[PDB]
Amino acid sequence: DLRLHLLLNTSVTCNDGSPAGYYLKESRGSRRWLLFLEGGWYCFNRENCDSRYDTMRRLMSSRDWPRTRTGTGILSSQPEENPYWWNANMVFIPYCSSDVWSGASSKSEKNEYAFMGALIIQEVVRELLGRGLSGAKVLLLAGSSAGGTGVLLNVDRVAEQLEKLGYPAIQVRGLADSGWFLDNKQYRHPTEAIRRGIRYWNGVVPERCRRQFQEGEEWNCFFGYKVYPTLRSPVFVVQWLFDEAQLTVDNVHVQEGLRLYIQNLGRELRHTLKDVPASFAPACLSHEIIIRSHWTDVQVKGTSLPRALHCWDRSLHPLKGCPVHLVDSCPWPHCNPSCPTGTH
Ligand SMILES: NC(=S)NNc1ccc(F)cc1
Ligand SMILES: NC(=S)NNc1ccc(F)cc1
Ligand SMILES: NC(=S)NNc1ccc(F)cc1
């Protein structure tokens, strides 16, 4: 179990003004630290956020959070469940800012809600330095869905934070799972909601990406294929080629028109990963990977994800028999026999 700690700086808050926080399980024999960002969509105006507050309150408030959480997948401490990093220090950061981890806006007389995702990450890092993170050799910032997009938006800011605080020796890296989306045409008749959200949240994007796209166009930096080339920290990208959240936004729920649409989506996703040297992209219809207990089940070209992540570690010290770039070439969901079939 990982144990809850509410932030000591109570001005860094969830949407409703309650304190944000993190769940922690220490491993004092390890110098590796894994900080995982939860996902769960977002909200972009008063009415949309009020609806989320009625029926998704744990994503907007800490008042009902439990005292502990079980670590699963890459957060598991058992070697059999987590061949990659079972002995690491484990941190789960709940998503309670509804801003894709981009916000830097406090509640006030002018704002019903606070959007502080980017500041929550910075404050978690600061408070962990007193609990052992100061001794780290590697800090892996990971996340799934909106948390995967949050990794891309925040990894370089964490690296800058630690440098300026006097810890230049800690190697900061990112792992973005199910957060690599395409701004494509829908199958039947989303970027406007991101544009509106950024203004509502006072959202921030990485500086090099901001300077490319310039004023009013920061929404571009929420799309992995546009923000990734601008990043300096090493980032490993995990992405199902036929992600269910991508298909949902595209209004896909099979005749020739839809067959061509699905094949084209897979082709375009594969193309965007061609110049991403650390990546794992199986040809499956699914959503999320890294905190599912059965994440060891899938393989690409005969290599599992925990193996690919281990090979990435080695590469950051091509390797014979230890690949890091693994993208399926077959063009239809479940053409890879290791794809999930139902759920547990
Ligand atoms: N929701 C958004 S901005 N889709 N992008 C897009 C819209 C039309 C098109 F022909 C190609 C791409
Ligand atoms: N209602 C269903 S299942 N898909 N449509 C859709 C859902 C969410 C969204 F942000 C855009 C479109
Ligand atoms: N649903 C079945 S058969 N396995 N579960 C699972 C398979 C692959 C993965 F990346 C995560 C979970």
Side-chain angles (χ1 to χ4, degrees), residues 271-316:
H271 174 79
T272 65
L273 297 172
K274 184 175 181 179
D275 297 334
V276 176
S279 54
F280 187 89
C284 311
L285 173 69
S286 191
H287 184 60
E288 302 185 336
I289 297 194
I290 66 177
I291 60 166
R292 296 164 76 178
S293 288
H294 291 85
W295 71 310
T296 54
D297 282 358
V298 59
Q299 57 179 33
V300 172
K301 295 174 167 74
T303 299
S304 70
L305 176 55
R307 177 158 185 77
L309 292 168
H310 161 68
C311 299
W312 186 46
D313 283 10
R314 286 184 56 197
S315 78
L316 295 174

mmCIF file of all heavy atoms in Angstrom, residues 271-316:
data_model
loop_
_atom_site.group_PDB
_atom_site.id
_atom_site.type_symbol
_atom_site.label_atom_id
_atom_site.label_comp_id
_atom_site.label_asym_id
_atom_site.label_seq_id
_atom_site.Cartn_x
_atom_site.Cartn_y
_atom_site.Cartn_z
ATOM 1 N N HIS A 271 3.082 6.783 -38.279
ATOM 2 C CA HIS A 271 3.959 7.787 -38.881
ATOM 3 C C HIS A 271 4.499 8.768 -37.845
ATOM 4 O O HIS A 271 5.689 9.111 -37.870
ATOM 5 C CB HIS A 271 3.250 8.557 -39.998
ATOM 6 C CG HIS A 271 4.071 9.692 -40.532
ATOM 7 N ND1 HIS A 271 5.104 9.505 -41.424
ATOM 8 C CD2 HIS A 271 4.052 11.017 -40.253
ATOM 9 C CE1 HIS A 271 5.670 10.668 -41.693
ATOM 10 N NE2 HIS A 271 5.053 11.602 -40.992
ATOM 11 N N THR A 272 3.638 9.245 -36.934
ATOM 12 C CA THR A 272 4.092 10.206 -35.927
ATOM 13 C C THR A 272 5.117 9.622 -34.963
ATOM 14 O O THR A 272 5.851 10.392 -34.331
ATOM 15 C CB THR A 272 2.926 10.833 -35.135
ATOM 16 O OG1 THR A 272 2.243 9.829 -34.358
ATOM 17 C CG2 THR A 272 1.942 11.568 -36.056
ATOM 18 N N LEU A 273 5.197 8.294 -34.843
ATOM 19 C CA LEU A 273 6.156 7.656 -33.941
ATOM 20 C C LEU A 273 7.457 7.261 -34.630
ATOM 21 O O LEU A 273 8.373 6.767 -33.957
ATOM 22 C CB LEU A 273 5.520 6.430 -33.257
ATOM 23 C CG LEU A 273 4.313 6.696 -32.331
ATOM 24 C CD1 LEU A 273 3.663 5.383 -31.869
ATOM 25 C CD2 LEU A 273 4.696 7.559 -31.109
ATOM 26 N N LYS A 274 7.573 7.474 -35.946
ATOM 27 C CA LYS A 274 8.735 6.967 -36.674
ATOM 28 C C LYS A 274 10.045 7.551 -36.154
ATOM 29 O O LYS A 274 11.070 6.855 -36.146
ATOM 30 C CB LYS A 274 8.571 7.204 -38.179
ATOM 31 C CG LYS A 274 9.707 6.622 -39.005
ATOM 32 C CD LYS A 274 9.470 6.762 -40.500
ATOM 33 C CE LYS A 274 10.626 6.150 -41.287
ATOM 34 N NZ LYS A 274 10.426 6.229 -42.762
ATOM 35 N N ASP A 275 10.042 8.815 -35.723
ATOM 36 C CA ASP A 275 11.236 9.470 -35.197
ATOM 37 C C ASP A 275 11.248 9.552 -33.668
ATOM 38 O O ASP A 275 11.928 10.419 -33.110
ATOM 39 C CB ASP A 275 11.399 10.878 -35.782
ATOM 40 C CG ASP A 275 11.604 10.886 -37.284
ATOM 41 O OD1 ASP A 275 12.094 9.884 -37.847
ATOM 42 O OD2 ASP A 275 11.276 11.923 -37.904
ATOM 43 N N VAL A 276 10.503 8.686 -32.984
ATOM 44 C CA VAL A 276 10.504 8.608 -31.522
ATOM 45 C C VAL A 276 11.289 7.362 -31.127
ATOM 46 O O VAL A 276 10.744 6.249 -31.195
ATOM 47 C CB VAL A 276 9.068 8.557 -30.971
ATOM 48 C CG1 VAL A 276 9.062 8.375 -29.453
ATOM 49 C CG2 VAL A 276 8.305 9.825 -31.358
ATOM 50 N N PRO A 277 12.556 7.488 -30.712
ATOM 51 C CA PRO A 277 13.406 6.291 -30.563
ATOM 52 C C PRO A 277 13.040 5.380 -29.397
ATOM 53 O O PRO A 277 13.394 4.195 -29.436
ATOM 54 C CB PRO A 277 14.826 6.866 -30.422
ATOM 55 C CG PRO A 277 14.628 8.258 -29.948
ATOM 56 C CD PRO A 277 13.319 8.735 -30.527
ATOM 57 N N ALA A 278 12.351 5.872 -28.370
ATOM 58 C CA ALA A 278 11.910 5.032 -27.256
ATOM 59 C C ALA A 278 10.382 5.017 -27.273
ATOM 60 O O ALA A 278 9.752 5.999 -26.871
ATOM 61 C CB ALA A 278 12.460 5.572 -25.934
ATOM 62 N N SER A 279 9.779 3.924 -27.752
ATOM 63 C CA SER A 279 8.325 3.872 -27.893
ATOM 64 C C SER A 279 7.836 2.425 -27.978
ATOM 65 O O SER A 279 8.574 1.522 -28.382
ATOM 66 C CB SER A 279 7.849 4.709 -29.091
ATOM 67 O OG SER A 279 8.515 4.338 -30.286
ATOM 68 N N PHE A 280 6.565 2.222 -27.591
ATOM 69 C CA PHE A 280 5.923 0.901 -27.565
ATOM 70 C C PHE A 280 4.481 1.113 -28.006
ATOM 71 O O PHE A 280 3.694 1.730 -27.278
ATOM 72 C CB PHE A 280 5.991 0.311 -26.145
ATOM 73 C CG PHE A 280 5.503 -1.129 -26.012
ATOM 74 C CD1 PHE A 280 6.380 -2.187 -26.195
ATOM 75 C CD2 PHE A 280 4.190 -1.412 -25.643
ATOM 76 C CE1 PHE A 280 5.955 -3.510 -26.052
ATOM 77 C CE2 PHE A 280 3.751 -2.730 -25.486
ATOM 78 C CZ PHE A 280 4.640 -3.786 -25.686
ATOM 79 N N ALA A 281 4.131 0.631 -29.201
ATOM 80 C CA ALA A 281 2.844 0.972 -29.818
ATOM 81 C C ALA A 281 2.199 -0.231 -30.488
ATOM 82 O O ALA A 281 2.377 -0.457 -31.697
ATOM 83 C CB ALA A 281 2.999 2.124 -30.815
ATOM 84 N N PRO A 282 1.421 -1.019 -29.738
ATOM 85 C CA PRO A 282 0.813 -2.231 -30.298
ATOM 86 C C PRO A 282 -0.481 -1.943 -31.058
ATOM 87 O O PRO A 282 -1.228 -1.012 -30.753
ATOM 88 C CB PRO A 282 0.529 -3.097 -29.057
ATOM 89 C CG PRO A 282 1.250 -2.387 -27.879
ATOM 90 C CD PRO A 282 1.253 -0.943 -28.274
ATOM 91 N N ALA A 283 -0.754 -2.790 -32.051
ATOM 92 C CA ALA A 283 -1.939 -2.635 -32.902
ATOM 93 C C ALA A 283 -3.171 -3.271 -32.240
ATOM 94 O O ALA A 283 -3.666 -4.322 -32.652
ATOM 95 C CB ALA A 283 -1.669 -3.248 -34.268
ATOM 96 N N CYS A 284 -3.695 -2.578 -31.222
ATOM 97 C CA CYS A 284 -4.836 -3.048 -30.436
ATOM 98 C C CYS A 284 -5.824 -1.915 -30.196
ATOM 99 O O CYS A 284 -5.445 -0.742 -30.143
ATOM 100 C CB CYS A 284 -4.404 -3.550 -29.042
ATOM 101 S SG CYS A 284 -3.009 -4.698 -29.033
ATOM 102 N N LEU A 285 -7.100 -2.287 -30.041
ATOM 103 C CA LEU A 285 -8.145 -1.394 -29.539
ATOM 104 C C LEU A 285 -8.202 -1.542 -28.017
ATOM 105 O O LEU A 285 -8.663 -2.570 -27.505
ATOM 106 C CB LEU A 285 -9.487 -1.764 -30.177
ATOM 107 C CG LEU A 285 -10.759 -1.067 -29.683
ATOM 108 C CD1 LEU A 285 -10.767 0.399 -30.078
ATOM 109 C CD2 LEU A 285 -12.004 -1.784 -30.211
ATOM 110 N N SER A 286 -7.727 -0.529 -27.295
ATOM 111 C CA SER A 286 -7.674 -0.565 -25.827
ATOM 112 C C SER A 286 -7.402 0.853 -25.326
ATOM 113 O O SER A 286 -7.402 1.811 -26.109
ATOM 114 C CB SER A 286 -6.641 -1.580 -25.320
ATOM 115 O OG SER A 286 -6.775 -1.789 -23.915
ATOM 116 N N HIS A 287 -7.183 0.994 -24.012
ATOM 117 C CA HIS A 287 -6.913 2.298 -23.415
ATOM 118 C C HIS A 287 -6.144 2.088 -22.113
ATOM 119 O O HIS A 287 -6.604 1.343 -21.239
ATOM 120 C CB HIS A 287 -8.229 3.054 -23.153
ATOM 121 C CG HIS A 287 -8.039 4.447 -22.633
ATOM 122 N ND1 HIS A 287 -7.362 5.420 -23.337
ATOM 123 C CD2 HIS A 287 -8.447 5.031 -21.481
ATOM 124 C CE1 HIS A 287 -7.352 6.541 -22.636
ATOM 125 N NE2 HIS A 287 -8.004 6.332 -21.506
ATOM 126 N N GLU A 288 -4.982 2.748 -21.995
ATOM 127 C CA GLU A 288 -4.060 2.673 -20.854
ATOM 128 C C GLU A 288 -3.318 1.337 -20.775
ATOM 129 O O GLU A 288 -3.809 0.312 -21.278
ATOM 130 C CB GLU A 288 -4.761 3.028 -19.528
ATOM 131 C CG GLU A 288 -5.383 4.435 -19.522
ATOM 132 C CD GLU A 288 -5.964 4.841 -18.171
ATOM 133 O OE1 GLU A 288 -6.317 3.949 -17.372
ATOM 134 O OE2 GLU A 288 -6.073 6.058 -17.909
ATOM 135 N N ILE A 289 -2.134 1.345 -20.147
ATOM 136 C CA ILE A 289 -1.297 0.154 -19.980
ATOM 137 C C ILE A 289 -0.640 0.083 -18.597
ATOM 138 O O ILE A 289 -0.762 -0.926 -17.892
ATOM 139 C CB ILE A 289 -0.212 0.040 -21.077
ATOM 140 C CG1 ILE A 289 -0.830 -0.110 -22.473
ATOM 141 C CG2 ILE A 289 0.704 -1.148 -20.784
ATOM 142 C CD1 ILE A 289 0.166 -0.570 -23.562
ATOM 143 N N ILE A 290 0.074 1.144 -18.196
ATOM 144 C CA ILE A 290 1.164 0.958 -17.234
ATOM 145 C C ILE A 290 0.724 0.671 -15.797
ATOM 146 O O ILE A 290 1.506 0.075 -15.049
ATOM 147 C CB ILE A 290 2.251 2.050 -17.319
ATOM 148 C CG1 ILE A 290 1.696 3.415 -16.911
ATOM 149 C CG2 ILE A 290 2.881 2.090 -18.720
ATOM 150 C CD1 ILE A 290 2.768 4.530 -16.919
ATOM 151 N N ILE A 291 -0.480 1.051 -15.359
ATOM 152 C CA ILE A 291 -0.888 0.654 -14.003
ATOM 153 C C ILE A 291 -1.887 -0.504 -13.985
ATOM 154 O O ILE A 291 -2.459 -0.806 -12.931
ATOM 155 C CB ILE A 291 -1.291 1.812 -13.070
ATOM 156 C CG1 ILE A 291 -2.468 2.602 -13.624
ATOM 157 C CG2 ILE A 291 -0.096 2.698 -12.757
ATOM 158 C CD1 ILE A 291 -3.075 3.518 -12.570
ATOM 159 N N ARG A 292 -2.074 -1.194 -15.107
ATOM 160 C CA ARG A 292 -2.873 -2.415 -15.105
ATOM 161 C C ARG A 292 -2.001 -3.586 -14.642
ATOM 162 O O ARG A 292 -0.866 -3.744 -15.102
ATOM 163 C CB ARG A 292 -3.445 -2.659 -16.501
ATOM 164 C CG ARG A 292 -4.426 -1.564 -16.943
ATOM 165 C CD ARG A 292 -4.705 -1.567 -18.463
ATOM 166 N NE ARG A 292 -5.607 -2.637 -18.903
ATOM 167 C CZ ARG A 292 -6.008 -2.812 -20.166
ATOM 168 N NH1 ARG A 292 -5.578 -1.986 -21.124
ATOM 169 N NH2 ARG A 292 -6.834 -3.816 -20.476
ATOM 170 N N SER A 293 -2.526 -4.397 -13.716
ATOM 171 C CA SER A 293 -1.732 -5.489 -13.149
ATOM 172 C C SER A 293 -1.223 -6.449 -14.215
ATOM 173 O O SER A 293 -0.131 -7.017 -14.064
ATOM 174 C CB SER A 293 -2.544 -6.261 -12.104
ATOM 175 O OG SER A 293 -2.708 -5.504 -10.918
ATOM 176 N N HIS A 294 -1.996 -6.661 -15.285
ATOM 177 C CA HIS A 294 -1.619 -7.582 -16.352
ATOM 178 C C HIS A 294 -0.833 -6.909 -17.480
ATOM 179 O O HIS A 294 -0.838 -7.406 -18.613
ATOM 180 C CB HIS A 294 -2.847 -8.322 -16.891
ATOM 181 C CG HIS A 294 -3.444 -9.296 -15.920
ATOM 182 N ND1 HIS A 294 -4.359 -8.924 -14.958
ATOM 183 C CD2 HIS A 294 -3.253 -10.626 -15.761
ATOM 184 C CE1 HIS A 294 -4.710 -9.984 -14.252
ATOM 185 N NE2 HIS A 294 -4.055 -11.031 -14.721
ATOM 186 N N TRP A 295 -0.122 -5.814 -17.188
ATOM 187 C CA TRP A 295 0.605 -5.092 -18.229
ATOM 188 C C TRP A 295 1.728 -5.912 -18.849
ATOM 189 O O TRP A 295 2.224 -5.536 -19.913
ATOM 190 C CB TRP A 295 1.142 -3.757 -17.694
ATOM 191 C CG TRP A 295 2.299 -3.848 -16.713
ATOM 192 C CD1 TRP A 295 2.389 -4.638 -15.591
ATOM 193 C CD2 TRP A 295 3.512 -3.097 -16.776
ATOM 194 N NE1 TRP A 295 3.595 -4.414 -14.953
ATOM 195 C CE2 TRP A 295 4.295 -3.469 -15.660
ATOM 196 C CE3 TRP A 295 4.004 -2.124 -17.660
ATOM 197 C CZ2 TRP A 295 5.552 -2.913 -15.415
ATOM 198 C CZ3 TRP A 295 5.249 -1.579 -17.416
ATOM 199 C CH2 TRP A 295 6.013 -1.979 -16.310
ATOM 200 N N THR A 296 2.145 -7.010 -18.203
ATOM 201 C CA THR A 296 3.171 -7.905 -18.735
ATOM 202 C C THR A 296 2.668 -8.789 -19.881
ATOM 203 O O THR A 296 3.478 -9.490 -20.505
ATOM 204 C CB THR A 296 3.701 -8.796 -17.601
ATOM 205 O OG1 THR A 296 2.602 -9.464 -16.965
ATOM 206 C CG2 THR A 296 4.454 -7.967 -16.555
ATOM 207 N N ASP A 297 1.364 -8.763 -20.182
ATOM 208 C CA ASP A 297 0.773 -9.687 -21.152
ATOM 209 C C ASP A 297 1.099 -9.321 -22.601
ATOM 210 O O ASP A 297 1.168 -10.216 -23.450
ATOM 211 C CB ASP A 297 -0.761 -9.683 -21.031
ATOM 212 C CG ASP A 297 -1.290 -10.489 -19.843
ATOM 213 O OD1 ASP A 297 -0.494 -11.098 -19.096
ATOM 214 O OD2 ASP A 297 -2.534 -10.506 -19.661
ATOM 215 N N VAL A 298 1.247 -8.029 -22.924
ATOM 216 C CA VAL A 298 1.373 -7.590 -24.315
ATOM 217 C C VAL A 298 2.832 -7.610 -24.766
ATOM 218 O O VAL A 298 3.756 -7.375 -23.977
ATOM 219 C CB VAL A 298 0.703 -6.208 -24.531
ATOM 220 C CG1 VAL A 298 1.325 -5.144 -23.626
ATOM 221 C CG2 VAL A 298 0.766 -5.769 -26.011
ATOM 222 N N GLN A 299 3.045 -7.894 -26.055
ATOM 223 C CA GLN A 299 4.384 -7.871 -26.641
ATOM 224 C C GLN A 299 4.308 -7.358 -28.076
ATOM 225 O O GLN A 299 3.296 -7.543 -28.763
ATOM 226 C CB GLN A 299 5.065 -9.248 -26.597
ATOM 227 C CG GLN A 299 4.293 -10.361 -27.269
ATOM 228 C CD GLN A 299 5.032 -11.691 -27.210
ATOM 229 O OE1 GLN A 299 5.751 -11.977 -26.243
ATOM 230 N NE2 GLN A 299 4.867 -12.504 -28.245
ATOM 231 N N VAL A 300 5.389 -6.702 -28.515
ATOM 232 C CA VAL A 300 5.567 -6.255 -29.896
ATOM 233 C C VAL A 300 6.885 -6.829 -30.399
ATOM 234 O O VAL A 300 7.924 -6.659 -29.752
ATOM 235 C CB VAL A 300 5.584 -4.718 -29.999
ATOM 236 C CG1 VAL A 300 5.975 -4.262 -31.409
ATOM 237 C CG2 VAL A 300 4.219 -4.131 -29.615
ATOM 238 N N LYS A 301 6.843 -7.509 -31.546
ATOM 239 C CA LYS A 301 8.037 -8.146 -32.114
ATOM 240 C C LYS A 301 8.728 -9.053 -31.092
ATOM 241 O O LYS A 301 9.955 -9.169 -31.055
ATOM 242 C CB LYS A 301 9.005 -7.111 -32.710
ATOM 243 C CG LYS A 301 8.462 -6.336 -33.929
ATOM 244 C CD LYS A 301 9.431 -5.224 -34.372
ATOM 245 C CE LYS A 301 9.092 -4.636 -35.746
ATOM 246 N NZ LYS A 301 7.898 -3.722 -35.763
ATOM 247 N N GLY A 302 7.931 -9.695 -30.238
ATOM 248 C CA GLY A 302 8.458 -10.613 -29.236
ATOM 249 C C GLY A 302 9.018 -9.989 -27.967
ATOM 250 O O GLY A 302 9.619 -10.707 -27.158
ATOM 251 N N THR A 303 8.841 -8.685 -27.753
ATOM 252 C CA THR A 303 9.406 -7.984 -26.602
ATOM 253 C C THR A 303 8.274 -7.368 -25.774
ATOM 254 O O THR A 303 7.414 -6.661 -26.321
ATOM 255 C CB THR A 303 10.400 -6.905 -27.079
ATOM 256 O OG1 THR A 303 11.484 -7.519 -27.797
ATOM 257 C CG2 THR A 303 10.969 -6.090 -25.904
ATOM 258 N N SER A 304 8.282 -7.625 -24.460
ATOM 259 C CA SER A 304 7.301 -7.058 -23.528
ATOM 260 C C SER A 304 7.618 -5.591 -23.201
ATOM 261 O O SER A 304 8.720 -5.094 -23.443
ATOM 262 C CB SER A 304 7.275 -7.863 -22.223
ATOM 263 O OG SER A 304 8.462 -7.666 -21.463
ATOM 264 N N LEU A 305 6.620 -4.879 -22.645
ATOM 265 C CA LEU A 305 6.874 -3.494 -22.239
ATOM 266 C C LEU A 305 7.878 -3.398 -21.094
ATOM 267 O O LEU A 305 8.788 -2.550 -21.164
ATOM 268 C CB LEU A 305 5.558 -2.757 -21.949
ATOM 269 C CG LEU A 305 5.665 -1.313 -21.426
ATOM 270 C CD1 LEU A 305 6.507 -0.434 -22.363
ATOM 271 C CD2 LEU A 305 4.274 -0.705 -21.227
ATOM 272 N N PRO A 306 7.784 -4.202 -20.024
ATOM 273 C CA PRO A 306 8.836 -4.127 -18.997
ATOM 274 C C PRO A 306 10.234 -4.359 -19.555
ATOM 275 O O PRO A 306 11.184 -3.689 -19.114
ATOM 276 C CB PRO A 306 8.405 -5.185 -17.969
ATOM 277 C CG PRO A 306 6.886 -5.228 -18.114
ATOM 278 C CD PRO A 306 6.693 -5.108 -19.619
ATOM 279 N N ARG A 307 10.395 -5.269 -20.526
ATOM 280 C CA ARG A 307 11.706 -5.436 -21.158
ATOM 281 C C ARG A 307 12.131 -4.175 -21.909
ATOM 282 O O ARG A 307 13.266 -3.704 -21.760
ATOM 283 C CB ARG A 307 11.735 -6.649 -22.097
ATOM 284 C CG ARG A 307 13.101 -6.767 -22.804
ATOM 285 C CD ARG A 307 13.405 -8.168 -23.301
ATOM 286 N NE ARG A 307 14.755 -8.256 -23.858
ATOM 287 C CZ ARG A 307 15.867 -8.329 -23.130
ATOM 288 N NH1 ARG A 307 15.797 -8.337 -21.806
ATOM 289 N NH2 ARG A 307 17.054 -8.410 -23.730
ATOM 290 N N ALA A 308 11.230 -3.609 -22.719
ATOM 291 C CA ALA A 308 11.572 -2.402 -23.475
ATOM 292 C C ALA A 308 11.994 -1.257 -22.550
ATOM 293 O O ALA A 308 12.938 -0.516 -22.862
ATOM 294 C CB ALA A 308 10.404 -1.987 -24.381
ATOM 295 N N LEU A 309 11.317 -1.101 -21.401
ATOM 296 C CA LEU A 309 11.693 -0.058 -20.445
ATOM 297 C C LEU A 309 13.071 -0.323 -19.832
ATOM 298 O O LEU A 309 13.849 0.619 -19.623
ATOM 299 C CB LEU A 309 10.613 0.084 -19.362
ATOM 300 C CG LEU A 309 9.274 0.641 -19.872
ATOM 301 C CD1 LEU A 309 8.175 0.478 -18.821
ATOM 302 C CD2 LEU A 309 9.408 2.115 -20.289
ATOM 303 N N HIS A 310 13.374 -1.592 -19.521
ATOM 304 C CA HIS A 310 14.714 -1.966 -19.064
ATOM 305 C C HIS A 310 15.774 -1.643 -20.115
ATOM 306 O O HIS A 310 16.857 -1.141 -19.784
ATOM 307 C CB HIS A 310 14.758 -3.453 -18.697
ATOM 308 C CG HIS A 310 16.144 -4.022 -18.658
ATOM 309 N ND1 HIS A 310 17.071 -3.664 -17.701
ATOM 310 C CD2 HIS A 310 16.766 -4.917 -19.465
ATOM 311 C CE1 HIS A 310 18.204 -4.309 -17.925
ATOM 312 N NE2 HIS A 310 18.045 -5.078 -18.986
ATOM 313 N N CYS A 311 15.485 -1.934 -21.389
ATOM 314 C CA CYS A 311 16.439 -1.619 -22.455
ATOM 315 C C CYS A 311 16.664 -0.115 -22.573
ATOM 316 O O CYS A 311 17.788 0.342 -22.862
ATOM 317 C CB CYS A 311 15.939 -2.201 -23.778
ATOM 318 S SG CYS A 311 15.768 -4.026 -23.778
ATOM 319 N N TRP A 312 15.603 0.668 -22.354
ATOM 320 C CA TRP A 312 15.714 2.123 -22.300
ATOM 321 C C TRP A 312 16.669 2.563 -21.188
ATOM 322 O O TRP A 312 17.570 3.384 -21.418
ATOM 323 C CB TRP A 312 14.309 2.705 -22.118
ATOM 324 C CG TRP A 312 14.178 4.209 -22.166
ATOM 325 C CD1 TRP A 312 14.730 5.071 -23.078
ATOM 326 C CD2 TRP A 312 13.392 5.009 -21.277
ATOM 327 N NE1 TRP A 312 14.346 6.375 -22.787
ATOM 328 C CE2 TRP A 312 13.528 6.357 -21.684
ATOM 329 C CE3 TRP A 312 12.601 4.718 -20.157
ATOM 330 C CZ2 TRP A 312 12.879 7.408 -21.021
ATOM 331 C CZ3 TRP A 312 11.970 5.764 -19.493
ATOM 332 C CH2 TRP A 312 12.106 7.091 -19.934
ATOM 333 N N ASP A 313 16.512 2.002 -19.980
ATOM 334 C CA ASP A 313 17.462 2.289 -18.902
ATOM 335 C C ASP A 313 18.899 2.032 -19.366
ATOM 336 O O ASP A 313 19.802 2.850 -19.131
ATOM 337 C CB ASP A 313 17.164 1.419 -17.668
ATOM 338 C CG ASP A 313 15.956 1.897 -16.849
ATOM 339 O OD1 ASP A 313 15.198 2.785 -17.290
ATOM 340 O OD2 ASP A 313 15.772 1.364 -15.723
ATOM 341 N N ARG A 314 19.137 0.879 -20.004
ATOM 342 C CA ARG A 314 20.494 0.546 -20.448
ATOM 343 C C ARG A 314 21.006 1.551 -21.473
ATOM 344 O O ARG A 314 22.184 1.932 -21.451
ATOM 345 C CB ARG A 314 20.541 -0.869 -21.035
ATOM 346 C CG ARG A 314 20.474 -2.008 -20.007
ATOM 347 C CD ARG A 314 20.621 -3.386 -20.676
ATOM 348 N NE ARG A 314 21.855 -3.476 -21.460
ATOM 349 C CZ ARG A 314 22.099 -4.395 -22.388
ATOM 350 N NH1 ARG A 314 21.202 -5.334 -22.662
ATOM 351 N NH2 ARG A 314 23.244 -4.367 -23.051
ATOM 352 N N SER A 315 20.141 1.974 -22.397
ATOM 353 C CA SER A 315 20.544 2.911 -23.438
ATOM 354 C C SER A 315 20.924 4.273 -22.877
ATOM 355 O O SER A 315 21.679 5.004 -23.525
ATOM 356 C CB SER A 315 19.430 3.058 -24.473
ATOM 357 O OG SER A 315 18.391 3.914 -24.011
ATOM 358 N N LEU A 316 20.430 4.626 -21.691
ATOM 359 C CA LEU A 316 20.718 5.914 -21.078
ATOM 360 C C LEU A 316 21.918 5.875 -20.136
ATOM 361 O O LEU A 316 22.210 6.882 -19.485
ATOM 362 C CB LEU A 316 19.475 6.457 -20.358
ATOM 363 C CG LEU A 316 18.305 6.795 -21.291
ATOM 364 C CD1 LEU A 316 17.067 7.195 -20.503
ATOM 365 C CD2 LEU A 316 18.711 7.907 -22.258
#
